[PDB]
PDB file of C-alpha atoms in Angstrom:
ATOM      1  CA  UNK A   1     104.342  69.748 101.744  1.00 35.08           C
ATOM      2  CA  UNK A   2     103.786  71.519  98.283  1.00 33.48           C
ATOM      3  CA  UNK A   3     106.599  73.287  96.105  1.00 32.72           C
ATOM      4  CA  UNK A   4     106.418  77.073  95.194  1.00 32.95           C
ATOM      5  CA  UNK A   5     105.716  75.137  91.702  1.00 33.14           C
ATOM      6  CA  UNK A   6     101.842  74.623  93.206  1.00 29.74           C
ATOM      7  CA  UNK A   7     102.101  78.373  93.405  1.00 29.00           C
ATOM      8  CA  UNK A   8     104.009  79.583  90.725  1.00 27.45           C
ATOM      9  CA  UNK A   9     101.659  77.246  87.917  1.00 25.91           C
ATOM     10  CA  UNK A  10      98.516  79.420  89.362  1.00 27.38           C
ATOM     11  CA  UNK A  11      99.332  82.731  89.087  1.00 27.22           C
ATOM     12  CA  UNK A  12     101.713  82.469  85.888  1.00 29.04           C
ATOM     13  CA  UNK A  13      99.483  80.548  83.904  1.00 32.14           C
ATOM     14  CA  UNK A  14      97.057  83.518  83.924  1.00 34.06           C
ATOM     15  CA  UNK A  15     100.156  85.598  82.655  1.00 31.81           C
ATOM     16  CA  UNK A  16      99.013  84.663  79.093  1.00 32.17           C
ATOM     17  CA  UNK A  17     101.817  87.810  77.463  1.00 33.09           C
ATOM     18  CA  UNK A  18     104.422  86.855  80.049  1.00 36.82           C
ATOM     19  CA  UNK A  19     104.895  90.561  81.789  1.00 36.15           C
ATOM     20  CA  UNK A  20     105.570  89.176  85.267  1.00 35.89           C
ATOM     21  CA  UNK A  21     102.790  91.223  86.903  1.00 34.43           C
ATOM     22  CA  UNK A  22      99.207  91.213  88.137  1.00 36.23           C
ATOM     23  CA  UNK A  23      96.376  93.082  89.579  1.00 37.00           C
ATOM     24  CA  UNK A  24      95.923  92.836  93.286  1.00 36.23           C
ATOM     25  CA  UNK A  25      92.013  92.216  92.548  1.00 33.37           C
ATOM     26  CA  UNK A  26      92.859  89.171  90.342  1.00 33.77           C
ATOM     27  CA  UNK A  27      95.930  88.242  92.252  1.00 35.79           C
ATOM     28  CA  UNK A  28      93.889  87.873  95.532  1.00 36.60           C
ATOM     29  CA  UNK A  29      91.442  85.723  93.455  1.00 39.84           C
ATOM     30  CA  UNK A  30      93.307  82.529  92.839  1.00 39.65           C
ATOM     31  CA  UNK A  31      95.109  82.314  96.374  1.00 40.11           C
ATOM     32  CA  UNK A  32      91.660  81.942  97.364  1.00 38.25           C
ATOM     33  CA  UNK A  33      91.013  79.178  94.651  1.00 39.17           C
ATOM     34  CA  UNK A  34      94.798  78.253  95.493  1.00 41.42           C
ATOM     35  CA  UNK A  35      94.162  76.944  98.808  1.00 41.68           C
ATOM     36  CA  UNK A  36      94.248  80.456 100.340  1.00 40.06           C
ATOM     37  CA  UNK A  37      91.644  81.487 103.302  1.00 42.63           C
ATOM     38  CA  UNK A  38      92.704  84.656 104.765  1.00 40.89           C
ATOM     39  CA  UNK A  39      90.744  87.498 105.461  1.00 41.76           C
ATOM     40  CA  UNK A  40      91.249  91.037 104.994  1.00 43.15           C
ATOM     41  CA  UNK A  41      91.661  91.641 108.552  1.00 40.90           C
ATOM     42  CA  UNK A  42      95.123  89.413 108.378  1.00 44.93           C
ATOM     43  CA  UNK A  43      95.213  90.426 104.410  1.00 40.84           C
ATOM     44  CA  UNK A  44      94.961  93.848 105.279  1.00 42.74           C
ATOM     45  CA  UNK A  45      98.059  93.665 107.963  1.00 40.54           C
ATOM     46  CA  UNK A  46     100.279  91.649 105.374  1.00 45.65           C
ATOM     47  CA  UNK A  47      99.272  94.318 102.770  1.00 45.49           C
ATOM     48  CA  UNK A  48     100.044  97.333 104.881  1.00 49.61           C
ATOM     49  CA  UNK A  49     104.315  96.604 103.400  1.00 52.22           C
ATOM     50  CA  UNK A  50     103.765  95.874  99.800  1.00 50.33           C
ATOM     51  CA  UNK A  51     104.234  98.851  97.245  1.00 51.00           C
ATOM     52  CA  UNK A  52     101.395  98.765  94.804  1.00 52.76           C
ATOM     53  CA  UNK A  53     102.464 100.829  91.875  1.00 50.63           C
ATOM     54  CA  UNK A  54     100.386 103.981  90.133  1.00 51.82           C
ATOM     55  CA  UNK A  55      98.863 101.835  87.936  1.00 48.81           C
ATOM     56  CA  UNK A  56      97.735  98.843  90.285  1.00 49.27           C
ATOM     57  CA  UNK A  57     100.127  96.008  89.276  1.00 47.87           C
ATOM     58  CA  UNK A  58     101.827  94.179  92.022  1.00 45.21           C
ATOM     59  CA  UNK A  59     104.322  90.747  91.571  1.00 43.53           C
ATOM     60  CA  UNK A  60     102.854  87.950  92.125  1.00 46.81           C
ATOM     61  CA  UNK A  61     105.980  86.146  93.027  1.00 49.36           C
ATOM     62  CA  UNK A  62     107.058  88.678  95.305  1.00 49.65           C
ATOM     63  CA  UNK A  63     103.834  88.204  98.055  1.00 45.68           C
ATOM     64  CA  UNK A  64     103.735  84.352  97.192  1.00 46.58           C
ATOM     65  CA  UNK A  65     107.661  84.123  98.954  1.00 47.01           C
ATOM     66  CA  UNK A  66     106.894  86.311 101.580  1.00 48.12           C
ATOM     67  CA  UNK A  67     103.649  84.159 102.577  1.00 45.26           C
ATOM     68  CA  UNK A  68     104.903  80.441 101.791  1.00 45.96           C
ATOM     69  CA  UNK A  69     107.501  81.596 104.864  1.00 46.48           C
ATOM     70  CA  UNK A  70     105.097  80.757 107.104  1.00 43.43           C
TER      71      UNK A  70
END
């Protein structure tokens, strides 16, 4: 199969100051371009755990973990 490397390029390339986090509009983005086709109904249940913060800046690694599970 593919490495968390597949994953872990995409989203951290974008990261062009290194600050280890990204919006949830943009993060969304390139799983989609990443070989990602879910849709908010499923998005919307996997979302309903993760802690945005106040100003709209999730981790990128942490969702990417908890998704290549399964």
């Amino acid at each position: 199969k593919a490495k968390t490397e597949d994953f872990v390029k995409a989203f951290q390339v974008f990261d062009k100051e290194s600050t280890g986090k990204v919006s949830v509009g943009d993060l969304r983005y390139m799983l989609t371009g990443l070989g990602e086709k879910l849709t908010d109904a499923e998005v919307d249940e996997l979302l309903k755990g993760v802690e945005v913060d106040s100003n709209g800046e999730i981790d990128y690694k942490k969702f990417i973990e908890d998704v290549l599970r399964q």
